[PDB]
Amino acid sequence: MQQSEHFSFGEQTEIEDIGGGLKRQMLGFNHELMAVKIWFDKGAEGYVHAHRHSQVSYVVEGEFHVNVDGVIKVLTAGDSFFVPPHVDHGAVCPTGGILIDTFSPAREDFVE
Amino acid sequence: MQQSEHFSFGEQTEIEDIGGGLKRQMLGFNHELMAVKIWFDKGAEGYVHAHRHSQVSYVVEGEFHVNVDGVIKVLTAGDSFFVPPHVDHGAVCPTGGILIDTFSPAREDFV
C-alpha cells in the first residue's frame, strides 16, 4: 500500500501467522524503510537466508543464536545485529522471543 | 565510519548523553539504514522538526505524546509511528522511557 499510517497501535495491527513458528506485525513502512515485529515460538527460525535489503535487528526479548557472515553470537534482550546487503545470515530462538527487524528498501513480500 | 559491526551489545555499546535528558545508543547502521535506541528522562522532549530521512519508530517502554504532521497521540510499549520525509514530528515523554528510532538514508549527523 505504498506506505503505512503515521501511527500504529500494537493492540490493533493484525499479527500475521507466516508459518515456521513465526508471527509478524507491521510497525511502519514506505518504499525505502520498513520495520516489523516478529514473535518466535521456541526453536523457531528463519532458515539460512540472504537478500539485497539492508537489515538492522533488535532483540526485544528471548535468546537468539544469530549467524552473520559465519560469525556466530548468542544475543539477548537489548542486543542487535546488522546484515549488509546480500550477506549470508541466520537466526534461531530456542527459548522463544521477539525481534524488531528493519530493512532499507521495503520488503515487497510483506505488504500483501 | 561507513557502517557498524554485524553484532552489537546493549551492555557494551557506549550510550551517548545528547543533552535535553536524552541519551542515544547505536544499534547498527550503514549508508542507507540506521537504528538507534533513545532513553528519555521523565518529561524530556524531542523538539518538533523535519528531515528528508524516512523514519520508523517503536516504543519499547514508557508513555509518549507523539506528534506527526501535527496529529498527537499517546503511545505506550509496543506501539509505533512512521514519519514520511520532511514531515513535522516530535515526541515528549512525561513518564520517562525508551524509543527505537530507525532511519532510511543513515543519519550522518549521528556518527
PDB file of N, CA, C and O in Angstrom, chain A residues 28-96:
ATOM      1  N   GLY A  28       5.671  -0.094  10.708  1.00  0.00           N
ATOM      2  CA  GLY A  28       5.548   1.068   9.836  1.00  0.00           C
ATOM      3  C   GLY A  28       6.455   0.931   8.626  1.00  0.00           C
ATOM      4  O   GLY A  28       7.533   0.343   8.734  1.00  0.00           O
ATOM      5  N   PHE A  29       6.032   1.460   7.483  1.00  0.00           N
ATOM      6  CA  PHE A  29       6.808   1.298   6.257  1.00  0.00           C
ATOM      7  C   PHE A  29       6.501   2.388   5.227  1.00  0.00           C
ATOM      8  O   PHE A  29       5.401   2.944   5.243  1.00  0.00           O
ATOM      9  N   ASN A  30       7.446   2.676   4.343  1.00  0.00           N
ATOM     10  CA  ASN A  30       7.241   3.144   2.972  1.00  0.00           C
ATOM     11  C   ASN A  30       8.225   2.448   2.034  1.00  0.00           C
ATOM     12  O   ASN A  30       8.968   1.552   2.430  1.00  0.00           O
ATOM     13  N   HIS A  31       8.245   2.862   0.779  1.00  0.00           N
ATOM     14  CA  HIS A  31       9.114   2.330  -0.248  1.00  0.00           C
ATOM     15  C   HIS A  31      10.554   2.139   0.190  1.00  0.00           C
ATOM     16  O   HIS A  31      11.253   1.254  -0.318  1.00  0.00           O
ATOM     17  N   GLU A  32      11.087   2.928   1.121  1.00  0.00           N
ATOM     18  CA  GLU A  32      12.529   2.832   1.352  1.00  0.00           C
ATOM     19  C   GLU A  32      12.874   2.447   2.782  1.00  0.00           C
ATOM     20  O   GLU A  32      14.048   2.310   3.125  1.00  0.00           O
ATOM     21  N   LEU A  33      11.869   2.271   3.632  1.00  0.00           N
ATOM     22  CA  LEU A  33      12.135   1.937   5.033  1.00  0.00           C
ATOM     23  C   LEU A  33      10.995   1.104   5.595  1.00  0.00           C
ATOM     24  O   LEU A  33       9.834   1.350   5.268  1.00  0.00           O
ATOM     25  N   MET A  34      11.304   0.107   6.422  1.00  0.00           N
ATOM     26  CA  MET A  34      10.251  -0.796   6.899  1.00  0.00           C
ATOM     27  C   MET A  34      10.652  -1.528   8.176  1.00  0.00           C
ATOM     28  O   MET A  34      11.725  -2.037   8.222  1.00  0.00           O
ATOM     29  N   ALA A  35       9.755  -1.535   9.157  1.00  0.00           N
ATOM     30  CA  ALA A  35      10.023  -2.170  10.441  1.00  0.00           C
ATOM     31  C   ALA A  35       8.881  -3.111  10.807  1.00  0.00           C
ATOM     32  O   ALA A  35       7.708  -2.730  10.762  1.00  0.00           O
ATOM     33  N   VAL A  36       9.219  -4.350  11.161  1.00  0.00           N
ATOM     34  CA  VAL A  36       8.197  -5.299  11.592  1.00  0.00           C
ATOM     35  C   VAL A  36       8.581  -5.881  12.962  1.00  0.00           C
ATOM     36  O   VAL A  36       9.730  -5.742  13.378  1.00  0.00           O
ATOM     37  N   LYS A  37       7.594  -6.489  13.594  1.00  0.00           N
ATOM     38  CA  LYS A  37       7.718  -7.217  14.844  1.00  0.00           C
ATOM     39  C   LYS A  37       7.488  -8.708  14.590  1.00  0.00           C
ATOM     40  O   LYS A  37       6.440  -9.082  14.074  1.00  0.00           O
ATOM     41  N   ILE A  38       8.477  -9.513  14.947  1.00  0.00           N
ATOM     42  CA  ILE A  38       8.446 -10.953  14.743  1.00  0.00           C
ATOM     43  C   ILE A  38       8.470 -11.708  16.073  1.00  0.00           C
ATOM     44  O   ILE A  38       9.424 -11.563  16.837  1.00  0.00           O
ATOM     45  N   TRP A  39       7.440 -12.500  16.334  1.00  0.00           N
ATOM     46  CA  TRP A  39       7.412 -13.362  17.506  1.00  0.00           C
ATOM     47  C   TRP A  39       7.931 -14.755  17.144  1.00  0.00           C
ATOM     48  O   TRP A  39       7.377 -15.388  16.246  1.00  0.00           O
ATOM     49  N   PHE A  40       8.966 -15.208  17.838  1.00  0.00           N
ATOM     50  CA  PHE A  40       9.465 -16.566  17.642  1.00  0.00           C
ATOM     51  C   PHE A  40       8.867 -17.537  18.657  1.00  0.00           C
ATOM     52  O   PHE A  40       9.040 -17.351  19.863  1.00  0.00           O
ATOM     53  N   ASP A  41       8.178 -18.577  18.209  1.00  0.00           N
ATOM     54  CA  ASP A  41       7.952 -19.763  19.037  1.00  0.00           C
ATOM     55  C   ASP A  41       9.290 -20.361  19.456  1.00  0.00           C
ATOM     56  O   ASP A  41      10.321 -20.094  18.833  1.00  0.00           O
ATOM     57  N   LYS A  42       9.297 -21.170  20.517  1.00  0.00           N
ATOM     58  CA  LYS A  42      10.548 -21.808  20.928  1.00  0.00           C
ATOM     59  C   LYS A  42      11.129 -22.608  19.761  1.00  0.00           C
ATOM     60  O   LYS A  42      10.423 -23.372  19.108  1.00  0.00           O
ATOM     61  N   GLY A  43      12.412 -22.409  19.502  1.00  0.00           N
ATOM     62  CA  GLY A  43      13.153 -23.075  18.456  1.00  0.00           C
ATOM     63  C   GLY A  43      12.753 -22.660  17.058  1.00  0.00           C
ATOM     64  O   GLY A  43      13.136 -23.303  16.077  1.00  0.00           O
ATOM     65  N   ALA A  44      11.970 -21.589  16.900  1.00  0.00           N
ATOM     66  CA  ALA A  44      11.613 -21.192  15.530  1.00  0.00           C
ATOM     67  C   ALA A  44      12.821 -20.538  14.868  1.00  0.00           C
ATOM     68  O   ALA A  44      13.768 -20.125  15.533  1.00  0.00           O
ATOM     69  N   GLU A  45      12.803 -20.444  13.544  1.00  0.00           N
ATOM     70  CA  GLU A  45      13.967 -19.962  12.802  1.00  0.00           C
ATOM     71  C   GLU A  45      13.521 -19.250  11.527  1.00  0.00           C
ATOM     72  O   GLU A  45      12.423 -19.513  11.030  1.00  0.00           O
ATOM     73  N   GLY A  46      14.332 -18.359  10.976  1.00  0.00           N
ATOM     74  CA  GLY A  46      14.375 -18.051   9.547  1.00  0.00           C
ATOM     75  C   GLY A  46      15.526 -18.823   8.908  1.00  0.00           C
ATOM     76  O   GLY A  46      16.683 -18.408   9.024  1.00  0.00           O
ATOM     77  N   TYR A  47      15.192 -19.939   8.275  1.00  0.00           N
ATOM     78  CA  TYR A  47      16.136 -20.782   7.555  1.00  0.00           C
ATOM     79  C   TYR A  47      17.144 -19.989   6.744  1.00  0.00           C
ATOM     80  O   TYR A  47      16.811 -18.930   6.200  1.00  0.00           O
ATOM     81  N   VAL A  48      18.383 -20.455   6.642  1.00  0.00           N
ATOM     82  CA  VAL A  48      19.531 -19.615   6.303  1.00  0.00           C
ATOM     83  C   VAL A  48      19.310 -18.939   4.942  1.00  0.00           C
ATOM     84  O   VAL A  48      18.828 -19.619   4.032  1.00  0.00           O
ATOM     85  N   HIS A  49      19.630 -17.662   4.800  1.00  0.00           N
ATOM     86  CA  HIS A  49      18.927 -16.650   4.026  1.00  0.00           C
ATOM     87  C   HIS A  49      19.815 -15.505   3.582  1.00  0.00           C
ATOM     88  O   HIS A  49      20.834 -15.186   4.199  1.00  0.00           O
ATOM     89  N   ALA A  50      19.463 -14.864   2.471  1.00  0.00           N
ATOM     90  CA  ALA A  50      20.149 -13.657   2.019  1.00  0.00           C
ATOM     91  C   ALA A  50      19.183 -12.798   1.202  1.00  0.00           C
ATOM     92  O   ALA A  50      18.205 -13.296   0.647  1.00  0.00           O
ATOM     93  N   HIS A  51      19.470 -11.497   1.140  1.00  0.00           N
ATOM     94  CA  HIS A  51      18.627 -10.595   0.346  1.00  0.00           C
ATOM     95  C   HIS A  51      19.355  -9.281   0.097  1.00  0.00           C
ATOM     96  O   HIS A  51      20.349  -8.951   0.751  1.00  0.00           O
ATOM     97  N   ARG A  52      18.882  -8.505  -0.880  1.00  0.00           N
ATOM     98  CA  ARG A  52      19.554  -7.248  -1.214  1.00  0.00           C
ATOM     99  C   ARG A  52      19.396  -6.228  -0.086  1.00  0.00           C
ATOM    100  O   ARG A  52      20.318  -5.480   0.226  1.00  0.00           O
ATOM    101  N   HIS A  53      18.217  -6.211   0.515  1.00  0.00           N
ATOM    102  CA  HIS A  53      17.848  -5.213   1.512  1.00  0.00           C
ATOM    103  C   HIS A  53      18.872  -5.100   2.630  1.00  0.00           C
ATOM    104  O   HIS A  53      19.370  -6.110   3.145  1.00  0.00           O
ATOM    105  N   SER A  54      19.218  -3.875   3.040  1.00  0.00           N
ATOM    106  CA  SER A  54      19.975  -3.719   4.283  1.00  0.00           C
ATOM    107  C   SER A  54      19.059  -4.106   5.444  1.00  0.00           C
ATOM    108  O   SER A  54      17.837  -4.012   5.332  1.00  0.00           O
ATOM    109  N   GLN A  55      19.636  -4.569   6.547  1.00  0.00           N
ATOM    110  CA  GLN A  55      18.798  -5.034   7.654  1.00  0.00           C
ATOM    111  C   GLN A  55      19.465  -4.692   8.984  1.00  0.00           C
ATOM    112  O   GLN A  55      20.646  -4.982   9.186  1.00  0.00           O
ATOM    113  N   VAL A  56      18.701  -4.072   9.882  1.00  0.00           N
ATOM    114  CA  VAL A  56      19.153  -3.920  11.272  1.00  0.00           C
ATOM    115  C   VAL A  56      18.107  -4.574  12.170  1.00  0.00           C
ATOM    116  O   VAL A  56      16.908  -4.425  11.932  1.00  0.00           O
ATOM    117  N   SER A  57      18.563  -5.326  13.169  1.00  0.00           N
ATOM    118  CA  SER A  57      17.654  -6.109  14.001  1.00  0.00           C
ATOM    119  C   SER A  57      17.949  -5.837  15.477  1.00  0.00           C
ATOM    120  O   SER A  57      19.101  -5.692  15.880  1.00  0.00           O
ATOM    121  N   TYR A  58      16.877  -5.759  16.262  1.00  0.00           N
ATOM    122  CA  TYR A  58      16.958  -5.504  17.692  1.00  0.00           C
ATOM    123  C   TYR A  58      16.283  -6.638  18.465  1.00  0.00           C
ATOM    124  O   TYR A  58      15.194  -7.065  18.086  1.00  0.00           O
ATOM    125  N   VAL A  59      16.925  -7.121  19.529  1.00  0.00           N
ATOM    126  CA  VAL A  59      16.278  -8.175  20.312  1.00  0.00           C
ATOM    127  C   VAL A  59      15.389  -7.546  21.389  1.00  0.00           C
ATOM    128  O   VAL A  59      15.898  -6.916  22.310  1.00  0.00           O
ATOM    129  N   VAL A  60      14.082  -7.723  21.236  1.00  0.00           N
ATOM    130  CA  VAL A  60      13.133  -7.241  22.239  1.00  0.00           C
ATOM    131  C   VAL A  60      13.173  -8.178  23.444  1.00  0.00           C
ATOM    132  O   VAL A  60      13.417  -7.727  24.565  1.00  0.00           O
ATOM    133  N   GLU A  61      12.959  -9.476  23.226  1.00  0.00           N
ATOM    134  CA  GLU A  61      13.235 -10.427  24.306  1.00  0.00           C
ATOM    135  C   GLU A  61      13.477 -11.837  23.777  1.00  0.00           C
ATOM    136  O   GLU A  61      13.006 -12.202  22.705  1.00  0.00           O
ATOM    137  N   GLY A  62      14.205 -12.626  24.559  1.00  0.00           N
ATOM    138  CA  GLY A  62      14.493 -14.018  24.259  1.00  0.00           C
ATOM    139  C   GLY A  62      15.965 -14.204  23.945  1.00  0.00           C
ATOM    140  O   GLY A  62      16.712 -13.230  23.865  1.00  0.00           O
ATOM    141  N   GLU A  63      16.405 -15.444  23.766  1.00  0.00           N
ATOM    142  CA  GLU A  63      17.808 -15.706  23.460  1.00  0.00           C
ATOM    143  C   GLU A  63      17.926 -16.077  21.979  1.00  0.00           C
ATOM    144  O   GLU A  63      17.265 -17.003  21.516  1.00  0.00           O
ATOM    145  N   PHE A  64      18.746 -15.324  21.254  1.00  0.00           N
ATOM    146  CA  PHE A  64      18.855 -15.514  19.809  1.00  0.00           C
ATOM    147  C   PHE A  64      20.270 -15.974  19.453  1.00  0.00           C
ATOM    148  O   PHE A  64      21.236 -15.279  19.758  1.00  0.00           O
ATOM    149  N   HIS A  65      20.350 -17.143  18.828  1.00  0.00           N
ATOM    150  CA  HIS A  65      21.570 -17.622  18.194  1.00  0.00           C
ATOM    151  C   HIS A  65      21.627 -17.032  16.782  1.00  0.00           C
ATOM    152  O   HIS A  65      20.873 -17.478  15.919  1.00  0.00           O
ATOM    153  N   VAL A  66      22.484 -16.045  16.557  1.00  0.00           N
ATOM    154  CA  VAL A  66      22.455 -15.385  15.250  1.00  0.00           C
ATOM    155  C   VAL A  66      23.750 -15.628  14.477  1.00  0.00           C
ATOM    156  O   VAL A  66      24.854 -15.454  14.993  1.00  0.00           O
ATOM    157  N   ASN A  67      23.595 -16.039  13.217  1.00  0.00           N
ATOM    158  CA  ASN A  67      24.738 -16.149  12.315  1.00  0.00           C
ATOM    159  C   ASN A  67      24.736 -14.994  11.312  1.00  0.00           C
ATOM    160  O   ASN A  67      23.765 -14.878  10.561  1.00  0.00           O
ATOM    161  N   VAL A  68      25.784 -14.188  11.323  1.00  0.00           N
ATOM    162  CA  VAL A  68      26.048 -13.231  10.255  1.00  0.00           C
ATOM    163  C   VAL A  68      27.424 -13.482   9.634  1.00  0.00           C
ATOM    164  O   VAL A  68      28.445 -13.328  10.297  1.00  0.00           O
ATOM    165  N   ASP A  69      27.424 -13.855   8.357  1.00  0.00           N
ATOM    166  CA  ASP A  69      28.668 -13.966   7.598  1.00  0.00           C
ATOM    167  C   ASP A  69      29.608 -14.972   8.256  1.00  0.00           C
ATOM    168  O   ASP A  69      30.826 -14.801   8.201  1.00  0.00           O
ATOM    169  N   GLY A  70      29.030 -15.997   8.873  1.00  0.00           N
ATOM    170  CA  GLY A  70      29.773 -17.071   9.503  1.00  0.00           C
ATOM    171  C   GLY A  70      30.171 -16.754  10.929  1.00  0.00           C
ATOM    172  O   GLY A  70      30.548 -17.643  11.694  1.00  0.00           O
ATOM    173  N   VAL A  71      30.092 -15.487  11.329  1.00  0.00           N
ATOM    174  CA  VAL A  71      30.286 -15.139  12.742  1.00  0.00           C
ATOM    175  C   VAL A  71      29.041 -15.499  13.541  1.00  0.00           C
ATOM    176  O   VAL A  71      27.918 -15.273  13.087  1.00  0.00           O
ATOM    177  N   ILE A  72      29.207 -16.087  14.725  1.00  0.00           N
ATOM    178  CA  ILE A  72      28.047 -16.588  15.459  1.00  0.00           C
ATOM    179  C   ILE A  72      28.046 -16.053  16.889  1.00  0.00           C
ATOM    180  O   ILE A  72      29.040 -16.121  17.617  1.00  0.00           O
ATOM    181  N   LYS A  73      26.913 -15.492  17.316  1.00  0.00           N
ATOM    182  CA  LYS A  73      26.850 -14.987  18.691  1.00  0.00           C
ATOM    183  C   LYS A  73      25.485 -15.330  19.282  1.00  0.00           C
ATOM    184  O   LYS A  73      24.497 -15.441  18.557  1.00  0.00           O
ATOM    185  N   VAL A  74      25.431 -15.511  20.601  1.00  0.00           N
ATOM    186  CA  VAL A  74      24.144 -15.613  21.284  1.00  0.00           C
ATOM    187  C   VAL A  74      23.712 -14.212  21.722  1.00  0.00           C
ATOM    188  O   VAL A  74      24.493 -13.540  22.390  1.00  0.00           O
ATOM    189  N   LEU A  75      22.511 -13.814  21.340  1.00  0.00           N
ATOM    190  CA  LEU A  75      22.026 -12.468  21.627  1.00  0.00           C
ATOM    191  C   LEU A  75      20.820 -12.527  22.566  1.00  0.00           C
ATOM    192  O   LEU A  75      19.971 -13.408  22.442  1.00  0.00           O
ATOM    193  N   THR A  76      20.756 -11.567  23.481  1.00  0.00           N
ATOM    194  CA  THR A  76      19.607 -11.437  24.378  1.00  0.00           C
ATOM    195  C   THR A  76      19.008 -10.037  24.284  1.00  0.00           C
ATOM    196  O   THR A  76      19.472  -9.199  23.503  1.00  0.00           O
ATOM    197  N   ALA A  77      17.968  -9.790  25.066  1.00  0.00           N
ATOM    198  CA  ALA A  77      17.252  -8.522  25.072  1.00  0.00           C
ATOM    199  C   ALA A  77      18.202  -7.334  25.150  1.00  0.00           C
ATOM    200  O   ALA A  77      19.122  -7.292  25.969  1.00  0.00           O
ATOM    201  N   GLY A  78      17.992  -6.361  24.261  1.00  0.00           N
ATOM    202  CA  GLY A  78      18.792  -5.150  24.211  1.00  0.00           C
ATOM    203  C   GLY A  78      19.942  -5.242  23.229  1.00  0.00           C
ATOM    204  O   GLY A  78      20.668  -4.271  22.999  1.00  0.00           O
ATOM    205  N   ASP A  79      20.156  -6.410  22.624  1.00  0.00           N
ATOM    206  CA  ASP A  79      21.284  -6.571  21.711  1.00  0.00           C
ATOM    207  C   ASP A  79      20.796  -6.353  20.280  1.00  0.00           C
ATOM    208  O   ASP A  79      19.594  -6.396  20.013  1.00  0.00           O
ATOM    209  N   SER A  80      21.719  -6.134  19.345  1.00  0.00           N
ATOM    210  CA  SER A  80      21.276  -6.005  17.955  1.00  0.00           C
ATOM    211  C   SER A  80      22.286  -6.591  16.972  1.00  0.00           C
ATOM    212  O   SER A  80      23.452  -6.812  17.299  1.00  0.00           O
ATOM    213  N   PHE A  81      21.841  -6.836  15.738  1.00  0.00           N
ATOM    214  CA  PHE A  81      22.791  -7.163  14.673  1.00  0.00           C
ATOM    215  C   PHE A  81      22.445  -6.403  13.386  1.00  0.00           C
ATOM    216  O   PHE A  81      21.320  -5.947  13.214  1.00  0.00           O
ATOM    217  N   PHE A  82      23.444  -6.317  12.527  1.00  0.00           N
ATOM    218  CA  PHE A  82      23.392  -5.660  11.231  1.00  0.00           C
ATOM    219  C   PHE A  82      23.846  -6.618  10.134  1.00  0.00           C
ATOM    220  O   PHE A  82      24.926  -7.192  10.242  1.00  0.00           O
ATOM    221  N   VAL A  83      23.015  -6.768   9.118  1.00  0.00           N
ATOM    222  CA  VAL A  83      23.289  -7.573   7.939  1.00  0.00           C
ATOM    223  C   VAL A  83      23.462  -6.721   6.690  1.00  0.00           C
ATOM    224  O   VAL A  83      22.493  -6.169   6.162  1.00  0.00           O
ATOM    225  N   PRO A  84      24.684  -6.607   6.193  1.00  0.00           N
ATOM    226  CA  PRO A  84      24.891  -5.848   4.945  1.00  0.00           C
ATOM    227  C   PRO A  84      24.123  -6.496   3.803  1.00  0.00           C
ATOM    228  O   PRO A  84      23.718  -7.661   3.874  1.00  0.00           O
ATOM    229  N   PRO A  85      23.875  -5.754   2.728  1.00  0.00           N
ATOM    230  CA  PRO A  85      23.196  -6.350   1.571  1.00  0.00           C
ATOM    231  C   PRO A  85      23.932  -7.609   1.085  1.00  0.00           C
ATOM    232  O   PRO A  85      25.153  -7.560   0.954  1.00  0.00           O
ATOM    233  N   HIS A  86      23.157  -8.645   0.868  1.00  0.00           N
ATOM    234  CA  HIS A  86      23.493  -9.915   0.262  1.00  0.00           C
ATOM    235  C   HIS A  86      24.340 -10.782   1.181  1.00  0.00           C
ATOM    236  O   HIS A  86      24.817 -11.839   0.755  1.00  0.00           O
ATOM    237  N   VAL A  87      24.535 -10.361   2.428  1.00  0.00           N
ATOM    238  CA  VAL A  87      25.366 -11.138   3.350  1.00  0.00           C
ATOM    239  C   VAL A  87      24.589 -12.326   3.910  1.00  0.00           C
ATOM    240  O   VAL A  87      23.427 -12.218   4.298  1.00  0.00           O
ATOM    241  N   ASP A  88      25.223 -13.498   3.944  1.00  0.00           N
ATOM    242  CA  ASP A  88      24.580 -14.687   4.486  1.00  0.00           C
ATOM    243  C   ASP A  88      24.288 -14.502   5.974  1.00  0.00           C
ATOM    244  O   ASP A  88      25.134 -13.968   6.691  1.00  0.00           O
ATOM    245  N   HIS A  89      23.120 -14.937   6.426  1.00  0.00           N
ATOM    246  CA  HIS A  89      22.787 -14.795   7.842  1.00  0.00           C
ATOM    247  C   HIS A  89      21.751 -15.827   8.273  1.00  0.00           C
ATOM    248  O   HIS A  89      20.982 -16.329   7.460  1.00  0.00           O
ATOM    249  N   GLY A  90      21.718 -16.131   9.575  1.00  0.00           N
ATOM    250  CA  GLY A  90      20.647 -16.952  10.129  1.00  0.00           C
ATOM    251  C   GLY A  90      20.310 -16.571  11.567  1.00  0.00           C
ATOM    252  O   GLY A  90      21.157 -15.978  12.231  1.00  0.00           O
ATOM    253  N   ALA A  91      19.107 -16.923  12.005  1.00  0.00           N
ATOM    254  CA  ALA A  91      18.694 -16.688  13.386  1.00  0.00           C
ATOM    255  C   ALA A  91      17.790 -17.802  13.903  1.00  0.00           C
ATOM    256  O   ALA A  91      16.822 -18.191  13.261  1.00  0.00           O
ATOM    257  N   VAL A  92      18.127 -18.313  15.078  1.00  0.00           N
ATOM    258  CA  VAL A  92      17.387 -19.333  15.801  1.00  0.00           C
ATOM    259  C   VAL A  92      17.048 -18.881  17.217  1.00  0.00           C
ATOM    260  O   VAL A  92      17.892 -18.292  17.881  1.00  0.00           O
ATOM    261  N   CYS A  93      15.845 -19.172  17.684  1.00  0.00           N
ATOM    262  CA  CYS A  93      15.443 -18.798  19.035  1.00  0.00           C
ATOM    263  C   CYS A  93      14.935 -19.982  19.848  1.00  0.00           C
ATOM    264  O   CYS A  93      13.758 -20.327  19.794  1.00  0.00           O
ATOM    265  N   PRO A  94      15.812 -20.622  20.610  1.00  0.00           N
ATOM    266  CA  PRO A  94      15.432 -21.837  21.337  1.00  0.00           C
ATOM    267  C   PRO A  94      14.392 -21.578  22.429  1.00  0.00           C
ATOM    268  O   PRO A  94      13.493 -22.381  22.669  1.00  0.00           O
ATOM    269  N   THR A  95      14.515 -20.442  23.106  1.00  0.00           N
ATOM    270  CA  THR A  95      13.656 -20.105  24.228  1.00  0.00           C
ATOM    271  C   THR A  95      12.338 -19.484  23.786  1.00  0.00           C
ATOM    272  O   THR A  95      11.390 -19.419  24.571  1.00  0.00           O
ATOM    273  N   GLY A  96      12.246 -19.019  22.542  1.00  0.00           N
ATOM    274  CA  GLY A  96      11.113 -18.152  22.184  1.00  0.00           C
ATOM    275  C   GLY A  96      11.514 -16.709  22.461  1.00  0.00           C
ATOM    276  O   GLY A  96      12.441 -16.455  23.239  1.00  0.00           O
TER     277      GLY A  96
END
